[PDB]
């Protein structure tokens, strides 16, 4: 996700644990209810 | 060639050979030989020895027309095999002069062919296949003296004849036994 | 080559090729020649989609060059049998059997694309079928059975007389989509819907 | 192209979805490998339920005679009734398998073709005349057995099967119902 | 060869054979034979026996031009088969001297060919196919005495003729019955 | 044409549902690769339970002799009784495998044909006359071994097998019961 | 060789090409000759990507020698149909039918890499179509209809007169990327964007 | 052979045939026949009957050089087909003595060939293709009396001629109508 | 035979060949002949490796006989397009198009192992292109356009004049690794980094 | 047929995860790219563990040879070449290309060395053929200097030996210098 560039001849390719979002943790397997009950992220 | 030399010396004795399948090449040289021999003598018989597995109808109809239109009699000789067009041209000989050698075999059957192309083309081919098969059966009925319904039923698949069976059926007039 | 995508449906992480995705939206795809192996596929898909929902329309995309007559009438009968209405869309060509399957869709639901080609012609034997004249008399009465049945089929679906189909399918009658709409193979040329 | 659709883990084509609904599909020519497939499917569906009937779809140009009688005997062996539906064509062996279904349960689509003919040999079988008179007693065994098989199922005399299969007797669906190969020309169920 | 020897002896009797498909090889030797026989005698007829499944239009147009430009009459003879270019050259004979042997068959149909290449090439080929087919139908209308619309409609697919049907239609002038 | 129920789990086509029910299937010709397949299945089913009967289905045109005796030995080796069922045909080497079942357990469908014939060379084996003397003593050994194999299983004299397999002897199901190749002809089990 | 893993997850045998990665970013890839099976693939992907998002632009990569005309107009119509704008990018070549698909992109969105060529020419018959002269007059009226339809397609996408397309596609007209920009096949010769 | 015997007897009458494609074998025997006939009589015309689909340029340039360098006039005759190298050699005949038989067809088009090999080889082939095509168009412009720009535009694809159209265009000087 | 080893990944289990293990490390193999399907694969890899990190250098291992010119310029333009620097390493051979792709790496990053062959030659027509002389003068001006473009391409990557490329590529100018460094196709004869 | 055993995987997967690259097919561009992919994978997995290369190959193309040869010499790992049955032509050069001390051969393995050949006929002008013949002498000299630096023999001695097919046994290839030890059988009985 951090590093999700555009792919191919079209869109631009300029468009650790500290860049974490729940979009990453839903992809990990944490349900979005579990994540919002954990507002603070230490890394 | 030797084979052409023996055939040339038998052409001089008015003995011609239908020895292959009746395609247009063998038919045209037989038609040429009948036209050549009827030009030499219009009163001496042509001996047509037939060892043929049959062939094209229109090629054999060329031979059959050249046989009939020749002013001389065409004595035909079933020599080993007279199948399909070869039995036709055998039975197409001058009556009284159609011979089977005593171990020749005569195969009478309906015409084979092939349908191809569009449905309008095949309807024309089948219409012409009905014309060819009716005309081929009419002439085999005329040659053998059999009814045309007898020729239709018997030619439906391969019907084989010995020399003695072809004599009774009407393809030949004599069995040569010397 | 056919790239495969992933659908996050009620489940998610479901790998799907575009042809499974067409079939999931009840689109049967006739893009290959109508032979037995293709007709076997389409009839299986027509019966599956009738079973999944007999009320929703089955869409049939036709990019076929056409083919075998019994494979044609296998697909044809299954298109007519199922409770679902068949929406035939022509994509490129519908030639031979395919234009009959294109006309075989539900009235009102037969479409082509504006540059689609509809090629109707009489049945033909592929190559020489040989045999005795009694065999060929059967095979020629059979292709006249096939020719009459194709014209009877196109008479039901184009609204033309079967003798008019017979005069038109003497040669290759190539129709465009607007010419096949006026003929009655389709009844929608299906205007493009691009937003620009 | 033949798509699939994921059920529930499992990936099923429409042929699986047919087969789970007791529908065996004869869609290719009857050779050994297809007959082996059909017989395996006939025994699986009989084991799953020998009282729920098996449906056999026949879109086939026919084929080998021993592959025919392999399917035929297995169709007659299984406890389930066989519902044969003809789809487009049933030629040769396929028409014998079409007639081989349970009486009352033999169907054809309205534009299906039913082609019956005597057995043949593909190409020439060489051999001595003792070999050939055995191969010809065999093709006469195959011809008589096929005409007997069509006599059990069409309700006709085997001598009348013999006169009809002299050439390609090509039947429509209505002509095969009058003949006895099918029992029902399957009418369309379109809602419109 | 024997086959060449019989054809040479019938060339001496002014009897030539169109016995194959009309390709450029058979056409050029027939054109050579017509040029050779018209050089020998310009007043004795050439008998052209035709057992032909048809062939190339331009090859048969070479024969047809050599037949017309020969100062001697070309008696044509449908022998078994006068199809396509072979019916054309049959009907191209001198009027009064076009013969069908009584079991010959005459096949009149439109020209066959092939389109290939780019769309600009095929537009030229089709333009020339319309020129060839109009000219072939004009001459068959001139030969048979049929209207050109009659020839157009009848040659659209294969139209077969018996000898008696070809006599009525106009391809031949007599049916030989000796 | 075969419905595979695909799925990371077992695939389960109808041949798996034959093999789990201890039915080995021989429907292809008996070449090396098929014989290798059959022997792998005969050993696996012996190891799963050596007391339950292995069923062998035979729809084979026959094939090579060493591939025949590969299957034959493994059928005779395993502790499980082999139930041979003929489907359609058991020709050539496959008639020997059909007779190679356990006595009482050799079955055939009613319209299954059983073809017995002496071994033949596939094509022409070239060589010097000392090479061909070896190859002819070989096929005479193959012929004698096939006859004494059919002598063991049909209960006949090997000289009777020699006179009968001089040409192609095609037996029907009832004729193979009288001969000794199968033990029972399967009756149809249909409830109609 | 194409690097591609199979993740299983006990739900699938899930394949991951780089083409699957391109198709996820709405890049349809015409890299083979335009035949029926290619056209069938491309149209199925255009309709999937229209359904996934009809607003985002489909990108079509074209590295193709070009092929059949009805397969061409199959892809062409499905391009022109979908609500998504189509970004056509030429890779290496767009010849024959593939140059028509290259011009068939949305105006302003037709790209070519700088050393790509664009080969336009009139339709042909690969091989000889045999037949009677009535059959060939049908097949030649067809190849003229194919020629006129290709020219009027290239007329409405290049802004040229269709008669100018006649005189230019009389032979092979190979354009460069910059020559196809001046001609109107593409709108942008795509600049390199390397860091160094 | 019979076919060689008729051609030999027409070689005695100074009638030679371009009846095939113009490859090097047919060209060398025509060049040999023109050299043989000009050695016999340097004042009697050679009749070159042309039934040719065209062929190699350099083979036909061998014939054309042997035609021009022969001290006797080469009367050319379009017989059925004078296409490509065959129209060239037709139009290469002595002016006043170029004939079309009235149903011959004349096909004038630019040379066909093939490029192969490396880019430096193909640049040489194209340079030589421009030399051959300019020289072939210059001579067809010289033969027919047409402008070279007229020959360039007309030969760009296949341009077909009837006998009457080839007479107007300039390939032949007369249409034989006997 | 190629062993597809198994990596325990997030999604159930990932099964990967050695090519995908290296594709995760920005490593591309041009190891097949450069045809359309090869060029299609390499362009898909080069774009995917650009989108994952456009600043991490892509390594293109080249063991190729070379091939088609448009497939060449499809790979070439995509190598020049991507934001990531391309590290071309020659293995064994880079012949024809492959030597152009070897020279098409980022300057300073074009390697060849010491026994790698680098073969440059002018483009050739494989087989014989038939046709009228107007067709062939198009096909010959095209292969002169291909020859000039390849010499122009090898000019700005080897730092030579395109005329100097033209005299050299008249025949098969076959270079070793050290001869291709002096020529300018590679920048470094890549020394063996074996630790013994 | 190749029986597998999943999650313990076929036998080639099990050899590869134990760092055994397999060359049993002929050395062409396809097999070279496979081996060079595997050499670069096993270098990236651990560069300090030995890669073992099994050679049952009849040999093949020279540029496919020197592709594998260079990559074997390129990777940080030591290459352990074992000859299995045969190492003919190009594959005997790869057999000699292992790390010294780590070139094994099975006792009945054949090692066949010969000079490079052109398979078939390369047509062309004499200037094309003068290039192709200076190239096959480039390939011949490079193969002999490659076998010179790995067998310890003079390159002219390699040239006289590879005049014809020099078939070596396992023990003859040890005395020649292609392999370093003939691998003794270690069966417990
Ligand atoms: C007495 C009858 C059966 C004569 C038989 N003739 C045919 O069946 C021949 C066999 C043949 C020979 C050459 C080329 C093609 C076909 N059939 C024909 O010539 C034929 C077929 N269909 C229409 C018109 N003629 B014989 O050859 O079996
Ligand atoms: C016009 C419609 C009815 C179908 C067109 N042609 C046919 O009728 C097809 C053409 C075809 C295709 C594949 C194999 C053999 C024959 N006819 C048949 O399928 C067919 C099959 N058996 C006997 C007679 N006709 B289409 O395939 O061009
Ligand atoms: C008429 C029914 C019973 C079967 C039809 N086909 C056959 O007769 C088939 C065609 C065929 C195939 C291969 C080799 C020889 C012959 N007959 C046989 O299976 C067959 C096999 N061995 C001996 C004799 N006939 B039909 O086409 O399915
Ligand atoms: C004479 C006409 C009316 C009927 C048939 N003739 C043709 O159409 C012939 C058949 C043929 C023969 C040899 C080579 C190629 C084609 N067609 C031509 O020669 C032909 C075709 N297109 C343009 C110009 N000539 B016949 O040969 O069946
Ligand atoms: C008679 C029984 C034993 C087997 C029959 N044929 C043989 O004897 C087979 C021939 C055959 C036939 C079909 C496929 C493969 C091989 N004989 C052999 O395998 C064989 C092999 N090497 C030497 C001698 N015989 B059967 O396959 O027709
Ligand atoms: C110029 C565009 C329209 C397409 C070009 N060629 C065509 O027009 C193609 C060439 C082709 C390709 C594959 C199979 C048969 C024919 N034309 C056709 O598709 C075609 C198909 N049927 C009849 C007439 N033309 B391209 O493929 O060179
Ligand atoms: C009047 C002109 C068009 C003459 C034509 N000649 C050619 O195009 C012939 C066709 C041909 C014949 C034999 C072998 C190869 C090629 N072309 C040539 O001979 C040719 C081709 N390229 C360079 C030099 N000569 B004719 O044959 O179409
Ligand atoms: C020298 C470089 C630029 C290219 C070399 N190969 C070529 O020249 C290739 C070989 C080839 C392939 C197919 C048809 C004709 C020619 N040239 C082409 O790609 C090509 C393709 N179409 C027309 C003209 N040239 B090499 O082998 O990669
Ligand atoms: C002796 C060693 C170096 C290699 C041996 N084979 C070769 O020399 C191989 C055999 C071969 C294969 C394909 C085309 C031409 C030649 N030489 C080459 O790879 C080769 C390829 N192109 C040009 C020159 N040599 B051996 O048989 O593996």
DSSP letters along G79-120, please? HHHSSS-EEEEEEEEEETHHHHHHHTSPTT-EEE-TT-EEEE
| C-alpha of residue D139 to centroid of ligand 1, in Å | 27
Return d(Cα G72, Cα G66) in angstroms, integer: 8
Residue J158 C-beta-side C-alpha neighbours within 13 Å: 28
Tokens encoding B93: 């000989």
Q: Whose CA is nearest to atom 2 of ligand 4?
A: E111
Run of H or E including E63: helix E57-69
- Judging contact as 3 or more Cβ pairs under 8 Å, the answer for E and B is yes
Dihedral (CA of H26, H27, H30, H32) sign: negative
Return d(Cα E17, Cα B112) in angstroms, integer: 27
CA distances to D117, D137, D153, F172 from D66, rounded to whole Å, are: 16, 15, 19, 11
Count of C-beta atoms within a 10 Å radius of residue I1 = 13
In the sheet that holds G5-7, the strands lie side by side as G15-16, G5-7, I14-16, I5-7
Cβ contact F37:F74 at 8 Å: no
Using CA coordinates, name the residue in chain H closest to E59. Answer: H80
**Helices and strands of chain H, counted as H and E runs:** 7, 8
Count of C-beta atoms within a 10 Å radius of residue A2 = 9
Return d(Cα I60, Cα I37) in angstroms, integer: 17
Tokens encoding H142: 């010289």
Q: Is H57 in the pocket of ligand 7 (CB under 6 A)?
A: yes
Angle, helices G69-81 vs G133-158, to 10°: value is: 30
State chain H's maximal CA–CA distance in angstroms.
55
Angle at F176 between CA F174 and CA F181, to 5 degrees: 140
Cβ contact F55:F85 at 8 Å: yes
Return d(Cα C66, Cα C72) in angstroms, integer: 8
CA distances to D96, D180, D181, D183 from D174, rounded to whole Å, are: 17, 10, 10, 9
Phi, psi angle pair for I186, to nearest 5°? -110, 170
Cβ contact D80:D54 at 8 Å: yes
C121 is catalytic: yes
Q: Whose CA is nearest to atom 12 of ligand 6?
A: G68
Phi, psi angle pair for D22, to nearest 5°? 60, 30
Cβ contact J100:J78 at 8 Å: no
| C-alpha of residue F23 to centroid of ligand 3, in Å | 28
Return d(Cα B7, Cα G40) in angstroms, integer: 66
Return d(Cα J69, Cα I92) in angstroms, integer: 8
Q: How was this structure determined?
A: cryo-EM
CA distances to B81, C49, D109, I46 from C78, rounded to whole Å, are: 54, 11, 8, 47
Query: How many contacts does C have with G, using Cβ atoms within 8 A?
Result: 133
Helix (H, G, I), strand (E, B) or coil at F118: coil
CA distances to C50, C169, G98 from C90, rounded to whole Å, are: 21, 19, 21
Residue G189: which of G177, G176, G173, G172 has the closest Cα?
Answer: G177
Angle, helices E24-40 vs E2-12, to 10°: value is: 40
| Helix ranges (DSSP H) in I6-132 | 18-23, 36-52, 69-81, 97-103
Could you say which of G127, G131, G144 has the minimum Cβ distance to residue E123? G144
G57 in contact with chain A, both atoms CB, cutoff 8 A: yes
| The one catalytic residue among I16, I96, I126, I134 | I96
Residue J162: which of J60, J90, J106, J78 has the closest Cα?
Answer: J90
Helix (H, G, I), strand (E, B) or coil at E44: coil
Q: Nearest bound ligand to CA C98? A: 2
Tokens encoding G164: 């100018």
* Chain F residues with CB-CB distance to G13 below 8 A: 7
Tokens 């009839």, residue located:
C43
Cβ contact G90:G158 at 8 Å: no
Cβ contact I183:I155 at 8 Å: no
Q: Which residues line ligand 8 (CB under 6 A)?
A: I 34, 66-70, 72, 96-97, 121, 123-126, 143, 146, 150
Question: How buried is B96 (Cβ within 10 angstroms: 0-12 exposed, 13-18 middle, 19+ buried)?
Answer: exposed
Count the residues in chain C.
196
Return d(Cα I143, Cα I134) in angstroms, integer: 14
CA distances to H60, H63, H99, H149 from H90, rounded to whole Å, are: 11, 11, 8, 20
Cβ contact E19:E47 at 8 Å: no
Phi, psi angle pair for J173, to nearest 5°? -80, -25
Hey, are the CB atoms on D138 and F170 less than 8 Å from each other?
A: yes
Tokens 């009699």, residue located:
B73
Residue J112: which of J27, J189, J53, J29 has the closest Cα?
Answer: J27
G 143-162: CB under 8 A from E = 143-144, 146-147
| C-alpha of residue C127 to centroid of ligand 2, in Å | 10
I 61-100: CB under 8 A from A = 81, 83
Residue C121: which of B145, I178, G142, J32 has the closest Cα?
Answer: G142
Helix (H, G, I), strand (E, B) or coil at I76: helix
Using CA coordinates, name the residue in chain E closest to H78. Answer: E62
Return d(Cα E166, Cα B154) in angstroms, integer: 31
Cβ contact D173:D110 at 8 Å: yes
Hey, are the CB atoms on D111 and C85 less than 8 Å from each other?
A: no
Tokens encoding J124: 């062309």
Q: Whose CA is nearest to atom 25 of ligand 3?
A: D121
Hey, are the CB atoms on D5 and C23 less than 8 Å from each other?
A: yes
Hey, are the CB atoms on E112 and G132 less than 8 Å from each other?
A: yes
Q: Nearest bound ligand to CA F60? A: 5
Tokens encoding D115: 């082609």
Tokens 């009489």, residue located:
C122
Return d(Cα H68, Cα H71) in angstroms, integer: 8
Torsion of CA B14, B19, B22, B27, to 10 degrees: -30
Using CA coordinates, name the residue in chain I closest to G189. Answer: I77
Angle at J72 between CA J70 and CA J77, to 5 degrees: 135
Hey, are the CB atoms on E117 and G127 less than 8 Å from each other?
A: no
Residues 6+ positions from B64 with CB-CB distance below 8 Å: B88, B89, B92, B139, E103
Hey, are the CB atoms on J71 and I65 less than 8 Å from each other?
A: no
Tokens encoding A2: 């951090």
* Chain I residues with CB-CB distance to A30 below 8 A: none
Phi, psi angle pair for G112, to nearest 5°? -145, 140
Helix (H, G, I), strand (E, B) or coil at E13: coil
Count the residues in chain A.
43
Could you say which of E35, E61, E63 has the minimum Cβ distance to residue H10? E35
Supply the residues of B annotated as catalytic.
84, 109
Q: Nearest bound ligand to CA G64? A: 6
Run of H or E including C75: helix C69-81
Cβ contact A9:I77 at 8 Å: no
Helix (H, G, I), strand (E, B) or coil at C168: helix
Strands B74-83 and B46-52: parallel
| C-alpha of residue G66 to centroid of ligand 6, in Å | 8
Resolution in A: 2.2
Q: Is B75 in the pocket of ligand 1 (CB under 6 A)?
A: no
Return d(Cα F87, Cα F114) in angstroms, integer: 10
C8 is catalytic: no
Torsion of CA E147, E150, E151, E157, to 10 degrees: 180
| C-alpha of residue C147 to centroid of ligand 6, in Å | 29
Q: Which residues line ligand 4 (CB under 6 A)?
A: E 54-58, 84-85, 88, 109-113, 129, 132, 136
| C-alpha of residue F33 to centroid of ligand 5, in Å | 14
Please tell me the distance in Å from I13's CA to the nearest CA on chain A.
15
Could you say which of G122, G132, G139 has the minimum Cβ distance to residue E118? G122
Return d(Cα D15, Cα F4) in angstroms, integer: 8
């Amino acid at each position: 996700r951090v590093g999700k560039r555009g792919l191919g001849f079209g869109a631009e390719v300029r468009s650790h644990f500290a860049d974490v979002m729940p979009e990453d943790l839903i992809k990990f397997g944490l349900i979005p209810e579990f994540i919002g009950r954990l507002p603070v992220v230490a890394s | 060639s030797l084979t052409d030399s023996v055939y040339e010396r038998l052409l001089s004795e008015r003995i011609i050979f239908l020895g292959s399948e009746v395609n247009d090449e063998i038919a045209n040289r037989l038609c040429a030989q009948i036209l050549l021999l009827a030009a030499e003598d219009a009163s001496k018989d042509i001996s047509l020895y037939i060892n043929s597995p049959g062939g094209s109808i229109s090629a054999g109809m060329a031979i059959y027309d050249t046989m009939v239109l020749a002013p001389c009699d065409i004595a035909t000789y079933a020599m080993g095999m007279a199948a399909s067009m070869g039995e036709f041209l055998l039975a197409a000989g001058t009556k009284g002069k159609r011979y089977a050698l005593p171990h020749a075999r005569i195969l009478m059957h309906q015409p084979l062919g092939g349908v191809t192309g569009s449905a309008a083309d095949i309807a024309i081919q089948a219409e012409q296949f009905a014309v060819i098969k009716k005309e081929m059966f009419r002439l085999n009925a005329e040659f053998t003296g059999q009814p045309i319904e007898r020729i239709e039923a018997d030619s439906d698949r391969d019907r084989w004849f010995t020399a003695a069976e072809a004599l009774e059926y009407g393809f030949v007039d004599h069995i040569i036994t010397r | 080559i056919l790239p495969s995508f992933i659908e996050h449906s009620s489940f998610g992480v479901k790998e799907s090729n575009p042809y499974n995705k067409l079939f999931e939206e009840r689109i049967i795809f006739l893009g290959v020649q109508v032979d037995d192996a293709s007709a076997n596929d389409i009839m299986a898909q027509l019966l599956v989609l009738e079973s999944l929902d007999p009320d929703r329309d089955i869409t049939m995309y036709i990019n076929s060059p056409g083919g075998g007559f019994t494979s044609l009438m296998a697909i044809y009968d299954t298109m007519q049998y199922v409770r679902a209405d068949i929406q035939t869309v022509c994509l490129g060509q519908a030639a031979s059997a395919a234009a009959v399957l294109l006309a075989a869709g539900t009235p009102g639901k037969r479409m082509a694309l504006p540059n689609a080609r509809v090629l109707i012609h009489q049945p033909s034997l592929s190559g020489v079928i040989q045999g005795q004249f009694s065999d060929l008399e059967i095979q020629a009465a059979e292709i006249e059975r096939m020719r009459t049945l194709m014209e009877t089929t196109l008479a039901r679906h184009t609204g033309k007389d079967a003798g008019v189909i017979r005069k038109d399918t003497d040669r290759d009658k190539i129709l465009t989509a607007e010419e096949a709409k006026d003929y009655g193979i389709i009844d929608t040329v299906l205007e493009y819907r691009k937003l620009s």
